[PDB]
Amino acid sequence: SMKELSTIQKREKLNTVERIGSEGPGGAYHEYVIKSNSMDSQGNYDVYETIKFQKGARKEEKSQHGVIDSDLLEIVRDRLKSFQAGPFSSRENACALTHVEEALMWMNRRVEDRIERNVLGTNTK
Amino acid sequence: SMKELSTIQKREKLNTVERIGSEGPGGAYHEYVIKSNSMDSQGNYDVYETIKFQKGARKEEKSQHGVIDSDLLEIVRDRLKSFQAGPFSSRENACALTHVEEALMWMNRRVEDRIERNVLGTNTK
Numbered sequence A, B: 001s002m003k004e005l006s007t008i009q010k011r012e013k014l015n016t017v018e019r020i021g022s023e024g025p026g027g028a029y030h031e032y033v034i035k036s037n038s039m040d041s042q043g044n045y046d047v048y049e050t051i052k053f054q055k056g057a058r059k060e061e062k063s064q065h066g067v068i069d070s071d072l073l074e075i076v077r078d079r080l081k082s083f084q085a086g087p088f089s090s091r092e093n094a095c096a097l098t099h100v101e102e103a104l105m106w107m108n109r110r111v112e113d114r115i116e117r118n119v120l121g122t123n124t125k
C-alpha cells in the first residue's frame, strides 16, 4: 500500500513524499517515494524517486542493505552549509543547519552507545 | 568530480556519502551518491543510490526539477516517528526527531517568508 506524508510545509510544495509498504524491522517503513506534485502539459511528473532503507539490523540474518537515515541528513547538512557560503545565505538556513547537525549528533550518540554495549546491528534494546 | 562528506558519525558507518560535480545555483551541489561500505560477491557495491536536487530556483529559465531538502528531512522524520512507536524506541531517537522537525520548521519559515515577499523560486535575497 501507499500513504502520503503530512509535511510541515503546506504551501508551494514541489514534491509530495509517499510511504510505501508495511511496517517492518524496528517498526519502520523501508521504502519512500518522492514525486512531483504537479504535471507538465504532457502529463509527466518530472520527479519520481524511490529511496529504500537498510531493512533489518545489519548483523541479523536476512537483513537487506540500503540507505540509512543519517545519510539523508548528512546530505541536507552539506546543502545547508553550501547555501550559507553562497549568495543567498539566511538566518533560517543557519538555524535549520544547527538543528540538522544536532539531530545527527543524537543519532551518532545512539550508535556509539550501541557500540559500547556491543549491540549495534542486533535486535536488542 | 567527487568528494566524500566528512560525517558526524565516525565509526561503523553503513554507507559513504559523496558529493558529485561542481557548485551550481545557490552555491550548492546538486548530485549526491550514497554507496555501501560493503561489496557483494562480485565486488560491486550493495548500495549505490543517487540523489539529484532541484537545480536553479524554480521560476528561473533553465531550472531543473528534482528532490528538495525538506523532502529528505520529512522521510527521516517519518522514520524516527516509526522507530519511536516501535519495539526499540530510545531517548536519542526522540531528541533527534525534535531537531529534525525544528529544522523543517525553519525551512518552512523561509518558504513562507519568500512567498510573502513574492521572491520564492527566484534568484533574489
Ligand SMILES: Nc1ncnc2c1ncn2[C@@H]1O[C@@H]2COP(=O)(O)OP(=O)(O)OC[C@H]3O[C@@H](O[C@@H]1[C@@H]2O)[C@H](O)[C@@H]3O
Binding pocket: A024, A025, A026, A027, A028, A053, A054, A055, A056, A057, A058, A059, A069, A107, A110, A114, A119, A120, A121, A122, A123, A124, B083, B088, B089, B093
Ligand atoms: N534511529 C534508529 N536507526 C536505525 N535503527 C533503529 C533506530 N531506532 C531503532 N532502530 C531499530 O533498532 C534495532 C537495532 O538498531 P541498530 O543497531 O542501529 O541497527 P542497524 O544495523 O544500523 O540497522 C538499522 C535497521 O534496523 C531496523 O531498526 C533497528 C533495529 O531493529 C530498521 O530496519 C533499521 O533501518
Ligand SMILES: Nc1ncnc2c1ncn2[C@@H]1O[C@@H]2COP(=O)(O)OP(=O)(O)OC[C@H]3O[C@@H](O[C@@H]1[C@@H]2O)[C@H](O)[C@@H]3O
Binding pocket: A083, A088, A089, A093, B024, B025, B026, B027, B028, B053, B054, B055, B056, B057, B058, B059, B069, B110, B114, B119, B120, B121, B122, B123, B124
Ligand atoms: N534552504 C534553501 N533551499 C533552497 N534554495 C536555497 C536555500 N538557501 C538558498 N537557496 C538559494 O536561494 C535562491 C532562491 O531560493 P528558493 O526561492 O527557495 O528557490 P527554490 O525554487 O525552492 O529552488 C531551490 C534551488 O535554487 C537554488 O538555490 C536557491 C536559489 O538560488 C538551488 O539550486 C536550490 O536547489
